[PDB]
Design a protein around this nucleic acid. Structure first.
Ligand SMILES: CN1C(=O)c2c3c(c(O)c(=O)n2[C@]12CC[C@@H]1C[C@@]12CO)C(=O)N(Cc1ccc(F)c(Cl)c1)CC3
Ligand SMILES: CN1C(=O)c2c3c(c(O)c(=O)n2[C@]12CC[C@@H]1C[C@@]12CO)C(=O)N(Cc1ccc(F)c(Cl)c1)CC3
Ligand SMILES: [Mg+2]
Ligand SMILES: [Mg+2]
Ligand SMILES: [Mg+2]
Ligand SMILES: [Mg+2]
Ligand SMILES: [Mg+2]
Ligand SMILES: [Mg+2]
Ligand SMILES: [Zn+2]
Ligand SMILES: [Zn+2]
Lengths: 184, 368, 368, 184
DNA sequence: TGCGAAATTCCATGACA
DNA sequence: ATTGTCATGGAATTTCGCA
DNA sequence: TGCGAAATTCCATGACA
DNA sequence: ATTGTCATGGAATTTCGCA
């Protein structure tokens, strides 16, 4: 068997609904399986059209051999099946109620949901403008298992934005109280 | 000088007047029988006015001004006086064209790594397509990998919106652009400072300085043209297609595509290269690091027969940017303060402003 | 061709396939282990589609289309098939630029006598001066003697009015002009027929053909520019001054002024030449007849390294005159009917019209 | 003494008033003394301004060393004297009531007045448009004394409009009757 | 029969938008 | 069914003045 | 150890208005 | 305070296939 490579598999999923930011309510998360590189796209809905509009931007940079997702309506639609067939992309689904990705990807999706939660607290309506900084942080995060960050594995160079200050990611007692205040 | 011409009529030698000629007096003026014919020798005190009268008939150069003078007069070293007048005529200096080519172009070193330097520029106005008229082109200097963004104007606001989407991937060290309003604005400078990006600007009115992106504009327009043959010019929907097509096109001289130089591996596109299939990502990245260092680099071409290279202190003239009808194409002489490189120079005009300009937009002032 | 690939798998030699290679079957397709790597050998019946798919990704030329194909396949003489597709792609043929320069320019013989041939052209629009916007420039081919007329438009009516004033002096055999509305009108043709003047027209969009007058336009504008420095652009009153100044300016290569070539004697202007003072008008006219025959004539320059000269039957493409945004710069191929001279040709487009065009406005169709 | 040359002397004079043609009433006649070449200019008056406007056109082609005229107001004015001084032209006048030019010039001015009279008859209001053909005829007229026409002497070449058909110049009995009809 | 300097000739450069 | 041109000012080359 | 043909490399041309 | 670039298709040159 041949070694794992970037663009072999993209893991896609939707995060949301989130508080509205610039009219957007969801985030489509795309993670390259090999490198752990993350692309984030704000959508107004978790629909096939929003998935196709966002993925048309990503697939103008790089096309994956396989797209992996759960059995969400947007990804199981015949329209999404047609879109993939057109680009020579194989669609791969996990069994309903049993979401399996990979250790590296499952861990990555945890960091994404937690980093979004941490930064939402205090400014839950300003996340649209923060998506580029969230992505840079995530892609310049050192991988304990691979010795390199997703940026290094994707481009084969060091970045101009190293994220040396490895922040908490865990909510402070102040952020926890401010978060429970919003849940009202 | 009537005293100078007095000794001449007598017959004693004067430095500059050949002694083998007959210097006589006729009609109240000093004359000489020359091989060409009999010519009047005017007193030194009249010569400047004569040269100026002859020159002013049609603001003629050296030979054409001389040929007029020589019809009536003769005096030692006539062209020395003609050239002295040509060098003082402001109308000739600012209106005449140069006849000396610029020195050979520089082939600046290719940025060492992807994201070291981006070259940005605008294409447009194009026929309207979904309310969009312009295209922001972002070319990575090392790889040649291009990002395309449709805009309604070549503005800072549209550049900032586009670059915030692009910089989600990676942040460049430098962004090189021309001096267009969109990029020279304080809002753009502020946007770059916030991110640690250094803004580098081309010399004024010299698109060759932005050559990396200019050349991609040619390829973008060529492909858009081909895809729109016998169809309405609906380019908006083709931008993503053109981007992907060009980023995956081989440069015959390099034998690599911009995608391959950026990632070291082809994505799922038609005719993907499979040569590193059995290598690990580390082995693949090691080979990519080697490919990136051994790319072909062109060298400065030979200088033309009559080129000029700048020198500190040299009197030089900047080209008028948008010269109006029946107005000079050149500014008044300036002095070269610093020679940044053989093709770039710092000048001080008559106003007193320091300008960094390309030698293509300068001519060396004639007649010293 | 599956029958062609059948004998190959067996092991017997087929013309074009090197016998020193191992041709096997894997995944239901014929493969070959090549130095570059393992490549699929597609049946002859699939190749055209492959070449077309690779070419269409970005409408790439020979090497860039080949490099894509070579990533997956191998077959005998791949470039022969690539070039066959490039030569059939209408979008590439009409959009791509030429990479072959035109052959060296002709230096047409100088008209033998004054009034043999006039070169006429319009300068303008210029800033308004007394309601006038254009200048009709009339240059005598032999002498270079120029007549200037201010006009409100580049019209037949204004050209006719001007030329009736000029033709009071003498009538020319030929009037050479470009294909501007003022000169191609039936009213102008009628005006010339009435006087026995033959109208000669430059090939379309080739001002070099009218070079004699074009070059005088440069001198007229240069002098007007100089005389108007730091003054409002009131050129109307300067036209007579410019005419007289230029007609009395020495050409350093000829060592004669247009006035001297026309009359053989200077009029009462500053610095008038007095060398024929003791000659009779007949002796003076005899010397003028000798001067007019011995003038310097330039010869065609050397051809560039990669020039092209037209051949009857050759597939050639005319340049689109005013190409719209995102539209091809070239017309569809045409055939060369007659080669008038190495720089002028008669073509037949796909419409069926006969066009006399300059080779500067043509490219030879690529890939035969 | 040096031989006679073109531009040595221009002989100027006014012909008119003539019937109005395109608003013009006079013709300023300029004859080069040496060659016999004629330039004709229509004017609305025999004034210094009309003389200066017309001669500014001629002196943009060739400047004479001398201008010869009678003592007509337009030529004796201080304005006309200033105009000539500016161009380095010497003004020369004939004695009042004693008009002397030269044999060649006197003969030329006779041909001009007679050719104008011949062509006026029948179309006395269309002479403005005929001035170019009158000039070509006059300048392509063979000189019995010099063997060459004024065009040949001025340019040193043959013309493209030779005037082989040496016309009458004398009025026919029909033209004489049509001329005496106009004098009413 | 040759030297140094002036004069003439050569000719690339660029613009007729 | 026509076609490049030529002013410009440094450099290259020839000529001039004197011996 | 060398031939004819195919493959690769060279590089002038021209356009980013 | 900066700087030309590179796709294109004939021609030139090198390599390939075979002996
Ligand atoms: C005044 N100006 C231009 O004229 C211009 C050009 C171009 C620009 O991009 C561009 O921004 N500008 C602006 C307008 C906006 C901003 C002030 C400007 C900065 O100079 C441009 O690409 N072209 C095309 C071109 C011609 C020749 C070449 F050698 C190359 Cl490499 C490219 C030449 C004209
Ligand atoms: C369509 N067109 C032109 O674009 C044009 C030009 C010129 C005209 O005289 C002229 O008449 N026209 C017209 C307009 C009127 C009539 C249809 C036309 C005929 O082609 C012109 O002089 N220039 C300047 C120029 C550029 C480069 C050169 F090599 C030379 Cl020699 C001159 C070039 C553009
Ligand atoms: Mg899920
Ligand atoms: Mg720009
Ligand atoms: Mg540009
Ligand atoms: Mg024209
Ligand atoms: Mg023109
Ligand atoms: Mg009288
Ligand atoms: Zn001047
Ligand atoms: Zn094509």
């Amino acid at each position: 068997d041949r070694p794992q490579k970037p663009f072999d598999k993209f893991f896609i999923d939707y995060i949301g609904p989130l508080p509205p930011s610039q009219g957007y309510l969801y985030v489509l998360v795309v993670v390259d399986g090999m490198t752990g590189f993350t692309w984030l796209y704000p959508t107004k809905a978790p629909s096939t059209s929003a998935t196709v509009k966002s993925l048309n931007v990503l697939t103008s940079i790089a096309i994956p051999k396989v797209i992996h997702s759960d059995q969400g309506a947007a990804f199981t639609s015949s329209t999404f099946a047609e879109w993939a067939k057109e680009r020579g992309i194989h669609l791969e689904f996990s069994t309903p109620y049993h979401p399996q990705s990979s250790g590296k990807v499952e861990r990555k999706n945890s960091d994404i949901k937690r980093l979004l939660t941490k930064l939402l607290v205090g400014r839950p309506t300003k996340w649209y403008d923060l998506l580029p900084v969230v992505q840079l942080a995530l892609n310049n995060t050192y991988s304990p298992v691979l010795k390199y960050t997703p940026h290094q594995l994707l481009f084969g160079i060091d970045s101009n934005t190293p994220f040396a200050n490895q922040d908490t990611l865990d909510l402070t007692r102040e952020e926890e109280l401010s978060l429970l205040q919003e849940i009202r | 000088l009537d005293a100078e011409l007095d000794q001449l009529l007598q017959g004693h030698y004067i430095k500059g007047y050949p002694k083998q000629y007959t210097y006589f007096l006729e009609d109240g003026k000093v004359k000489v029988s020359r091989p060409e014919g009999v010519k009047i020798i005017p007193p030194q005190s009249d010569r400047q006015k004569i040269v100026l009268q002859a020159h002013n008939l049609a603001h003629t150069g050296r030979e054409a001004t001389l040929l007029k003078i020589a019809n009536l007069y003769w005096w030692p070293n006539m062209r020395k006086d003609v050239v002295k007048q040509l060098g003082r005529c402001q109308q000739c200096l600012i209106t005449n064209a140069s006849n000396k080519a610029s020195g050979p172009i520089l082939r600046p070193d290719r940025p060492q790594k992807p994201f070291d330097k981006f070259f940005i520029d605008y294409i447009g106005p194009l026929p309207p397509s979904q309310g969009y008229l312009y295209v922001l082109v972002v070319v990575d200097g090392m790889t040649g990998f291009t990002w395309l963004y449709p805009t309604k104007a070549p503005s800072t606001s549209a550049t900032v919106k586009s670059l915030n989407v692009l910089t989600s991937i990676a942040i460049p060290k430098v962004i090189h652009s021309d001096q267009g309003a969109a990029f020279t604005s304080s809002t753009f400078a502020e946007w770059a400072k916030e991110r640690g990006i250094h803004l580098e600007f081309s010399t004024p009115y010299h698109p060759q300085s932005s050559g990396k992106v200019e050349r991609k504009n040619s390829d973008i327009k060529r492909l858009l043209t081909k895809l729109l043959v016998g169809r309405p010019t609906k380019w908006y929907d083709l931008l993503p297609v053109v981007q992907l097509a060009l980023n995956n096109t081989y440069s015959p001289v390099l034998k690599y595509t911009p995608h391959q130089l950026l990632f070291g591996i082809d994505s799922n596109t038609p005719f993907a290269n499979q040569d590193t299939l059995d290598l690990t990502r580390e082995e693949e990245l090691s080979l990519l690091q080697e490919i990136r260092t051994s790319l072909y680099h062109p060298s400065t071409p030979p200088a033309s027969s009559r080129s000029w290279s700048p020198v500190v202190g040299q009197l030089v003239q900047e080209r008028v940017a948008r010269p109006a009808s029946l107005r000079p194409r050149w500014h008044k002489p300036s002095t070269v303060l610093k020679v940044l490189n053989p093709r770039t120079v710092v000048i001080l005009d008559h106003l007193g402003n320091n300008r960094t300009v390309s030698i293509d937009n300068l001519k060396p002032t004639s007649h010293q």
